[PDB]
Amino acid sequence: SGHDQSTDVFSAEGRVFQVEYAGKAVDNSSTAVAACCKDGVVVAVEKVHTSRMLEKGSNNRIHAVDRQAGICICGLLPDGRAIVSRARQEAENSRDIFATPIRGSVLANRVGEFMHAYTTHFAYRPFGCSAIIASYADDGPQLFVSDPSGTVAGYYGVALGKAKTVAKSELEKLDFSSLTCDEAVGKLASILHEVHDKQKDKLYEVEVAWVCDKSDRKFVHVPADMVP
Amino acid sequence: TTILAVSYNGGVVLAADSRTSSGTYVVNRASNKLTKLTKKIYCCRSGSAADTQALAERVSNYLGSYQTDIGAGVNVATAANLFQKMCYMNRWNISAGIIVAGYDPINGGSVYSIPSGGSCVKLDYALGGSGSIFLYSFFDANYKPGMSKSECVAFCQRAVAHAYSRDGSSGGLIRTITLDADEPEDQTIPWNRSPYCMEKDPKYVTQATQNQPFSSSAKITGNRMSSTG
């Protein structure tokens, strides 16, 4: 019973149940999908709306961390926003202190270090979100995923959330050497429309963002015309 | 203030900027720091305009009396020595960097720096004023003695221009005067025809990349010069 109450405690098997349980919060969350191309990177996230009466752009899961970089949050949105707020703090320390856009690989490691910190101490809990860091700084288009554990990994393509498995099947059909950001916006949104449960989650939209040559290596929401 | 005097064969060229400044405002834009003592002995006046004008008028008056009573031309050495005595006597009361320079038929062209202490050094060329400090390296590098009268004037003007380009306290017109066996040739180069200024030097056209648009790259491009870009 006491093996899993806090994240400061390994189990006998050698694992940190509170971090696994935080992971479960992401796997029960709305599906997010992303693709790293030559042209840049694209993030599409399904937002499950609880109500018919929300404004367009309510509970935005995708947030600019810097000009060149954006975090899409799959999981508990509020927790996600604490990571966004930190990723921002790190992005602005890179420009304030080192006069450089933070590199994607760096920004990701910094996001993972932060998320991991919360897995080590009895007083805190793990974050309930996987951050998807999309960046196009001097290290090129980079797509990373920090999970609740703090584990960062680079991806060509990546699916998170309750349709993770099926959305990944569809991401494997894409050739990543070939595809452009303009195709990806189409295919990633198409994937999220396909994998979505129509009977369970009636009200939803697909928030897409990118950072590509097209967008001036600036991390922005894609216009509503490309999205379908 | 930038004053200099170089020797050529026959005689000397005095050269000077034209700016008196009350610190950071230009009180006079067209001062004449080349001050006649005799027909062919001028001084260049640096420091307190009051103090150098007062000395230059005192020494000019002594030299005129002297010249009348000996019934012959005054030697530059004489002018320098008088100016030294006065600049020394009052060294605590006045701020006065003088260059006495001129022609006399005995010694030809002569230059004397009388700096703030009341030293009197006989030299091939002398620098004076706030702007002098810019020229020492300019002369070391570019000055070649045994110049023509014309080359010395061109050089002296190029010098004064190089000083007043960097010295805030110097600027305006470049006044020269050649003193030799012939009738003195004053000339006044206006700033819009100066032989050098930083504003016109192609070296300093491209602006420092200080401003720099907010970018997704560490690549320095240029200054941001439009809000749209």
Which chain B residues contact residue A216 at CB under 8 A?
Answer: 216
CB contact under 8 A, B216 and A99: no
In angstroms, what separates the C-alpha of B209 from chain A's closest C-alpha? 14
Q: Catalytic pick from B1, B38, B52, B178?
A: B1
CB contact under 8 A, B219 and A138: yes
Resolution for this PDB entry, in angstroms: 2.8
Domain B1-229 matching CATH 3.60.20.10: the answer reads yes
Active site residue B78: no
Which chain B residues contact residue A217 at CB under 8 A?
Answer: 215-217
Tokens 């994937």 found at: A191
Residues 6+ apart with CB under 8 A from A135: A41, A65, A66, A68, A69, A70, A102, A103, A104, A107, A108, A141, A142, A144, A211, A219
Interface residues on B facing A, Cβ-Cβ cutoff 8 A? 214-219
CB contact under 8 A, B216 and A101: yes
In angstroms, what separates the C-alpha of B219 from chain A's closest C-alpha? 9
Nearest 5°: phi and psi at A95? -80, -40
Cα separation, A4 vs A11, whole angstroms: 7
CB contact under 8 A, B218 and A216: no
Q: How many helices (H) and strands (E) does chain A have?
A: 5, 10
Instruction: Inform me whether the C-beta atom of residue A136 falls under 8 Å from chain B C-beta atoms.
Output: yes
Q: Using an 8 Å Cβ cutoff, are A39 and A188 in contact? A: no
For B130-150, the DSSP string reads TTHHHHHHHHHHH--SS--HH
Q: Using an 8 Å Cβ cutoff, are A37 and A212 in contact? A: yes
Which chain B residues contact residue A214 at CB under 8 A?
Answer: none
Query: Would you call B21 helix, strand, or coil by DSSP?
Result: strand
Instruction: Inform me whether the C-beta atom of residue A126 falls under 8 Å from chain B C-beta atoms.
Output: no
Q: Using an 8 Å Cβ cutoff, are B83 and B110 in contact? A: no
The closest alpha carbon to B67, from B92, B44, B90, B40, belongs to B40
B179 - beta bridge partners?
B12
The closest alpha carbon to A158, from A74, A35, A61, belongs to A35
Cα separation, B164 vs B162, whole angstroms: 6
Task: Calculate helix-pair angle for A164-171, A181-195, nearest 10 degrees.
Answer: 140
Cα separation, B160 vs B18, whole angstroms: 10
Count: domains in chain A: 1
Method: cryo-EM
Cα separation, A15 vs B127, whole angstroms: 82
Nearest CA in chain A to B212: A99
Mutation pick from B212, B215, B216 vs chain A, by most beta carbons of A within 10 Å, is B216
Q: Which domain holds residue A135?
A: 1-228
Burial status of residue A109 (CB atoms within 10 A of its CB: 0-12, 13-18, 19 or more) = middle
Q: CATH number for the domain including A30?
A: 3.60.20.10
- Alpha-carbon dihedral of residues B50, B52, B56, B59, nearest 10 degrees? 110
Residues 6+ apart with CB under 8 A from A102: A66, A68, A69, A90, A91, A93, A94, A95, A110, A135, A137
In angstroms, what separates the C-alpha of A217 from chain B's closest C-alpha? 6
